[PDB]
Structure 1
Amino acid sequence: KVFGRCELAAAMKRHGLDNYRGYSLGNWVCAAKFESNFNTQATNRNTDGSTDYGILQINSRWWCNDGRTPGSRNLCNIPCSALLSSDITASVNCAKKIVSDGNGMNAWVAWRNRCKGTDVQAWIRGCRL
């Protein structure tokens, strides 16, 4: 599924991401835009044999099991295939674990480089929440 901006904002708000662990909703929408272009089926392979899955590009070395990543820890206790659903619940529930692990939203490279330090509230402007 490819979400619209406000559609994704509303879905993320319903699943409890607004202000979760200190991160306002616009952070999460900005991260999804630059990680996956709002596409629930995005995947990207990495040089360590891991793959990033879904709308928030969750990595198979640490967080989900894809059966093909050496050294996997599966800390979200979910198959990576669940993260390619058009329903974002499993991705959001795993993202909540990732942001609580330690280093906040710094797990998302595109957030760190392209969202942090900007006015991220602009990402939810004009949306009916």
Structure 2
Amino acid sequence: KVFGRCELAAAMKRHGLDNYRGYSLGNWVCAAKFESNFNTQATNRNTDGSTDYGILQINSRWWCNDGRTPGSRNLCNIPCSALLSSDITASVNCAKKIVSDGNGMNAWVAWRNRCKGTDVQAWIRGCRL
């Protein structure tokens, strides 16, 4: 599913991401825009052989099982395919574990490089929330 900007802001809010670990909803929308262009089916292979999955490009090295990432963990206890659903629940619940891990949203290199310190409230401007 390719979300609209306000549609995804609403869905993330309904699933409890607004101000989760102190990160305002615009941070999460911005991170999704640059990780996936709001496409739940986004995948990207890393040079180390791990794969990133879904709207927040969550990596198989630590967070999900795809059966092809040797020596990896599955800390969200989900198949990586769950992260590609039209239903964002699995992605949101796994993102809450990642952002709690110690480095906050810096876990997402596109957030650090493209969202951090910018006017992220622009990403939710206009939306009925």
CA distance in 1, matches of 2:91, 2:7: 16
The CA RMSD over aligned residues, in Å, is 0.4
Q: Distance in 1 between matches of 2:2 and 2:54?
A: 11
In structure 2, what is the Cα distance between the partners aligned to 1:40 and 1:108?
16
Question: Normalized against structure 2, the TM-score is what?
Answer: 0.99
Secondary structure of 2:100 counterpart: helix
- Following TM superposition, by how much is the alpha carbon of 1:71 offset from its aligned partner in structure 2, in angstroms? 1.3
Classify the secondary structure of the residue corresponding to 2:81: helix
TM-score under structure 1 length normalisation: 0.99
Deviations 1:76-113 (A, max 9, x none): 01100101101100000000000001100011111000
User: Which residues of structure 2 form unaligned runs of 5+?
Assistant: none
Gaps of 5+ in 1: none
Displacement of 1:128 in angstroms is: 0.1
Cα offsets for 1:55-93 (capped at 9, x unmatched)? 000000000000000111100011001011011000000
Q: Percentage identity across aligned positions?
A: 100
The structural deviation recorded for 1:117 is 1.1
Give the 4+ runs in structure 1 shifted more than 6 A. Answer: none
Query: Hey, what does 2:86 align to over in structure 1?
Result: 86
Deviation at 1:33, TM superposition (A): 0.2
